[PDB]
Amino acid sequence: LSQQWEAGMSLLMALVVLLIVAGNVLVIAAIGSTQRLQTLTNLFITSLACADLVVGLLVVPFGATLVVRGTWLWGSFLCELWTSLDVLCVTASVWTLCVIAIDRYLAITSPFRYQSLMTRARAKVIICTVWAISALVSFLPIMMHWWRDEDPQALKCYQDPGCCDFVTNRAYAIASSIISFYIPLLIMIFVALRVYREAKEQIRKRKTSRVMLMREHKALKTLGIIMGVFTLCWLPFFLVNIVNVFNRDLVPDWLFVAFNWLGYANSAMNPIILCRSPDFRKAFK
């Protein structure tokens, strides 16, 4: 019966991996093989797609084996690397959504300046800075063991190469969550709502035709959907992560894991969402 669950979950995880990996390669292949999709925003989309791709190839396969076997098979170093890449992908994603919100705000409010000043190369530089800072804030604290808790349970997990539970002290949990999630999430939401407001005002009345503005706003809508779904997928985990560092009995471990898998599931959603945008649909066809 445990073999039926092992075999059953194994196959379900293979399909999740295939969906995340294939989905996010297509998105990147759609963008790179099509003139229409060579926009600055879609270079920022490529960063999200890269983060979702790392999740599909490195994070989810290691995670699947932990869920199905109930122990960590890959030793203490790969536990630490796995955790660092997991943290990196979430951080780079939410900061990239924050860059997209800000970019688009400046694009609608100063289209004249924006278009003379922003270039394809300058977008890549911003993306690099995001991933470089994300890697700093992600890898450094994990390398330095700033996250470790002093409880016997925690210490036993650290002595055991078979335990890869990210048991953390409250200082690290609150601080890392603020820098890597809550701050960029709040900036993204605040700025996106203003973009929504300003787009909404421009159609109501730019010299631009009203039908051209509606085509601009369909693309803006895709981004807000990605933004909204990212929030739904990750905000539960991060709220529960805080509750769990204050009291471990308030959140059972299996429930913690379920919330985590809702987060990983976001990596599968974006290609499917991008599929319903008009230009991306043609490209996939």
Ligand X SMILES: NC(=O)CN(CC(=O)O)CC(=O)O
The answer to whether residues 227 and 270 touch, using CB atoms and an 8 Å cutoff, is: no
- Residue 166 binding ligand XTK, by CB under 6 A: yes
- Residue 76 binding ligand X, by CB under 6 A: yes
In whole angstroms, give the CA distance from residue 153 to residue 146: 17
Contacts with 180 (C-beta within 8 Å, 6 or more apart), sequence order? 87, 90, 91, 94, 95, 134, 137, 138
The separation between CA 212 and the C-alpha centre of its own chain, rounded to angstroms, equals 31
- Residue 263 binding ligand XTK, by CB under 6 A: yes
The site that binds ligand XTK (CB under 6 A) totals a number of residues, namely 15
* Residue whose CB is less far from Na ion, 52 or 279: 52
- Residue 49 binding Na ion, by CB under 5 A: no
- Residue 75 binding ligand X, by CB under 6 A: yes
Site for ligand X in 153-182 (CB under 6 A): 161
Per-residue CA distances from 141 to 53, 83, 173, 210, 223 (Å) = 24, 11, 11, 50, 31
* Residue whose CB is less far from Na ion, 87 or 108: 87
Within the chain, how many helices (H) and strands (E) appear? 12, 0
Cβ count within 10 A of residue 273: 16
Q: How far is the CB of 141 from ligand X (least distance, A)?
A: 20
Convert 123-134 to b/e letters by CB count within 10 Å (16 or more is b): beebbeebbeeb
Site for ligand OLC in 111-130 (CB under 6 A): 111, 114-115, 120
Is 241 a known ligand-binding residue?
A: no
Partner touching 75 among ligand OLC, Na ion, ligand X, none, CB below 5 to 8 Å by kind: ligand X
Binding residues for cyanopindolol: 86, 176, 260
| Residues found near ligand OLC in the complex (CB under 6 A) | 38-41, 101-102, 104-105, 107-108, 111, 114-115, 120, 137, 140-141, 146, 149-150, 169-172, 175-176, 179, 189, 191-196, 199-200, 203, 216-217, 219-221, 223-225, 227-228, 231-232, 245
